[PDB]
A paper describes a structure:
In the present study, we elucidated the crystal structure of [name] H37Rv [name] (hereafter referred to as MtHigA2), which contains an HTH motif. The HigA antitoxin represses the transcription of HigBA or forms a stable HigBA complex, thereby preventing the ribonuclease activity of the HigB toxin and the associated cytotoxic events. Structural studies of MtHigA2 confirmed that it has three regions: (i) a disordered N-terminus that is liable to cleavage, (ii) an α-helix bundle containing an HTH motif for DNA binding and (iii) a β-lid for dimerization. The antitoxin MtHigA2 has two binding partners: DNA and the toxin MtHigB2.
The crystal structure of MtHigA2 was determined from three distinct crystal forms. Form I belonged to space group P212121 and was determined to 2.0 Å resolution, form II packed in space group P43212 and was determined to 3.2 Å resolution, and form III was solved in space group P3121 to 3.4 Å resolution. However, the N-terminal ∼25 residues are unstructured in all three observed crystal forms. All dimers share the β-lid as their major dimeric interface, but the position of the α-helix bundle varies. When the different dimers are aligned based on a single HTH motif from one monomer, the corresponding motif in the dimer pair shows a different relative position. The flexibility in dimerization leads to drastic changes in the locations of positively charged residues on the HTH motif, including His54, Arg56 and Arg59. To predict the physiological dimer, each form was submitted to the PISA server to calculate the strength of the dimer interface. Interestingly, all of the forms had similarly favourable dissociation energies (ΔG): −14, −15 and −17 kcal mol−1 for forms I, II and III, respectively. This suggests that the flexibility of the β-lid does not impact the formation of a stable dimer and is likely to contribute to function. The three different crystal structures in our study reveal the flexibility in dimerization mode while anchored by the β-lid.
Author numbering:
A (entry chain B): 31 to 100
B (entry chain A): 31 to 101
C-alpha cells in the first residue's frame, strides 16, 4: 500500500536531474531518498522534493485513537 | 498543531530529559520538535520521538485526486 517516491516521480515522466533542479537541492539528495530510505532525509528536504511533483506532504500522528498533523 | 506534543508529553507528565533517553536522541532535539520547528528534523529522528512517546508517525502525500503512503 506504501508507494516509495521513485515510482511516484515516474508517474509524471520526469528525471531526477529535473526534480532536483526545480526542488533546488543536490542530485546527491534525490538519489539517496529515491533509493528507498526516508530517514536520513530532512523533512524540509522531503517537503521540497514532493512540492516538485505538484503534490503536498502531510505528517499525521496516531497514538491510541488521537490524530493531528505537524 | 503547535502546542501539541508538549501537551501530549505533559499529558502523561513526562520530562523532556526522560523522552530524550526513551527514544535515545539529544534532549536539545526535543525542545526544537516540541518547540514547533520540524522542517529541520530528519524523518527517522522525528519518528523515534513519536515511537518513544507511544504513538505512530504517518506521512500521507496528496497529489491532486490521490493519496499515497511511503513509511
Amino acid at each position: 500500500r506504501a508507494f516509495r517516491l521513485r515510482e511516484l516521480r515516474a508517474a509524471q515522466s520526469l528525471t531526477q536531474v529535473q526534480v532536483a533542479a526545480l526542488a533546488h537541492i543536490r542530485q546527491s539528495r534525490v538519489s539517496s531518498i529515491e533509493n528507498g530510505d526516508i530517514g536520513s532525509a530532512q523533512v524540509n528536504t522531503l517537503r521540497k522534493y514532493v512540492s516538485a511533483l505538484g503534490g503536498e506532504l502531510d505528517i499525521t500522528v496516531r497514538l491510541g485513537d488521537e490524530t493531528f498533523t505537524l
